Symmetry: D2
């Protein structure tokens, strides 16, 4: 049911330090190549008073290239689909919770997202919009207590060229039982390709590739 080319529709409702917003997205991706692009529009709550980058990794691991030797939990989840939940703990104490329930209808993934962020300091890089991009990252995928889990040590590049660190923990749950993978990794690169002044319109891109660990030789 997952074709070489697929469409994507998304709705996020969220709050950051109490500021409510809604963002809608429409995009397309190549699940077997691990690439996807989305156009995102702020529907309610503009202008967003915080760094848009905190939202972008919340805007589907179906879009990750899996080699034959690693079970692909995500593609096997369909047609029923899966959901994930995530915590994001930034090093200055800003904390976010997020969830996405992902379904498939025809050739289009639907993503129903909730995002909430708290305790971002008023003069920190998130509330002052001082971020530039996420550095490329490697997600560690493992099974704990029967739950597929990804851990990432993420870093946002800041104005000035320093970094602002974030610990991600994501739990992934297929809607029916799926063959679980062994310990593995997924490399990611995410980029805002373009945006308008206050990020009311954003074009976003991600590439992701699963792999094993470094060999002995």
């Amino acid at each position: 049911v997952i074709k070489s080319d697929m469409k994507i529709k998304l709705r996020m409702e969220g709050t950051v330090n109490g500021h409510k917003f809604v963002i809608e997205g429409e995009g397309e991706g190549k699940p077997y190549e691990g690439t996807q692009t989305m156009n995102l529009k702020v529907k309610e709550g503009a202008p967003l008073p915080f760094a848009y980058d905190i939202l972008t990794t919340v805007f589907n691991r179906v879009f990750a290239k899996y080699p034959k030797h690693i079970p692909d939990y995500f593609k096997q989840s369909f047609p029923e689909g899966y959901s994930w939940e995530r915590s994001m703990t930034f090093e200055d104490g800003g904390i976010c919770t997020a969830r996405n329930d992902i379904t498939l209808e025809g050739d289009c993934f639907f993503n129903e997202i909730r995002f909430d962020g708290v305790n971002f300091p008023p003069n920190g890089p998130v509330m002052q919009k001082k971020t530039l991009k996420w550095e490329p990252s490697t997600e560690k995928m493992y099974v704990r207590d029967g739950v597929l889990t990804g851990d990432i040590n993420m870093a946002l590049l800041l104005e000035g060229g320093g970094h602002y660190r974030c610990d991600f923990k994501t739990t992934y749950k297929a809607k029916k039982g799926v063959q679980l993978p062994d310990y593995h990794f997924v490399d990611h690169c995410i980029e805002i390709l373009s945006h308008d002044k206050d990020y009311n319109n954003v074009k976003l891109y991600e590439h992701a590739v699963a792999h094993s660990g470094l060999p002995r030789q």
Copy 2:
């Protein structure tokens, strides 16, 4: 505007590991003595599949006995009101965010609450309902970057007698500029007085007292 006896109305909308719920609450307490009681009713999502104890400290620091020598941020915030936001990081990776916007009308406090919890392990004490109560605690209040903040190392007493740790960080913000206090403490005690089979109905009580720490 804050009287010796006040009433409290609450609505909480939340999710825990994807499960939606709504809880409404009614009560009263006594502000200047720092005590409070609430009756809480589940409206949606019954039976709650998680330990009720994760919600109880989210169900107002107005209800805290403050001495003369520490400025009382919360009482001075009214009538205009205040809000707070909180992160709760449990030792097994369960993480909650929560927020309460508090306003007053006449003499009832209205509490509008959002609560979201993620990553609670399926066989941990929260999803297995193994919690007994929160241990008494001491919140540390300090100002950082102009924001009154409270830090707490919390512990839930478990079945079997062990403890399950949670680190709280709350930021408090008045709607109008209020005098900020110096570094201090607030002692807390919170109890579920009684419940029905699946905590559809709950009677809650908190006692809280502010202080400066030793020499005293």
Copy 3:
């Protein structure tokens, strides 16, 4: 009852902070049942210390804590045999310390053999730049886990200019012999450098500590 109203204290600390080796010796006195102690500390090697002396002070004995009759006193019951403790200190900018103290008793005098190691203090942070003023008073939570008496503290250093620098302490305490374990309780602390000379080569330190059950 080998623990008397007036006790003497001797101490030797060997350690490292960001690779810098030092030795400090101390001689002091205390009142175990009043929960007070004072020590004179002298740098023997590693002068002048290139880091904030405050990071060391809580490492320079819970025998010196006033325990009320209703909470078992693990520390006083540890003697004559003694006890040891181990500690981690996790500062919010990523500086991390490990410390241990082996405590013995000869006549009226406690001997303390201490190791201390601190790593990853940022070169322009408050520790390596000596911006600290004092530790705020604190409350340690005492509990038993995996059969080990453990103390957790959320500590804060007051900084020049009025901010705070936070540190998470976890201490494990082990009597040489089986000693009755207390239930969950608290110890309030206050620690002060009373005086010091230029480079903290000579320091006089004081601590006051009192155990309690909390609210009530």
Copy 4:
């Protein structure tokens, strides 16, 4: 230039885990430009070690990592003068270790002077019960903060029964002289105990490491 295709390695570690003192000496060889090394390690003092040997193995030199031309190799450029590193290891059950290595080069041989201290390992946890099997392969994130080259790693020990035991590593690396600092990048690692005798008195260890830019 001073670093050849084949180099020898000598090592001495002095340490203490939960108060237990030990000394281990190593001798080995490696291929710095291929990113590989092997060492034989012998317990000299403190046998039989009462904790999981796997906690020591990543302490037993980033010279042995293959660096592509487009990423500056801080470690090889540190020689002949050398470099040192400090590390914290925070295990998910509260065990915390600090470690340091001062690395020098004499002729064709690296010398490593190591200190290791661990505290607060639970008596029934996988370290004290020796239930660890191996470290999973990892990716170290290298970045420069405050002008200090730092590596962050989210490490995991595979356990008997198939679970994992997580450890957060932070290492800071400091050349003796000023060396060109690299941009943000990654180092993949694989470390394996190739063999060992009873109680790990004699151990052969292997590591492979490669630096890269990650995706694309």
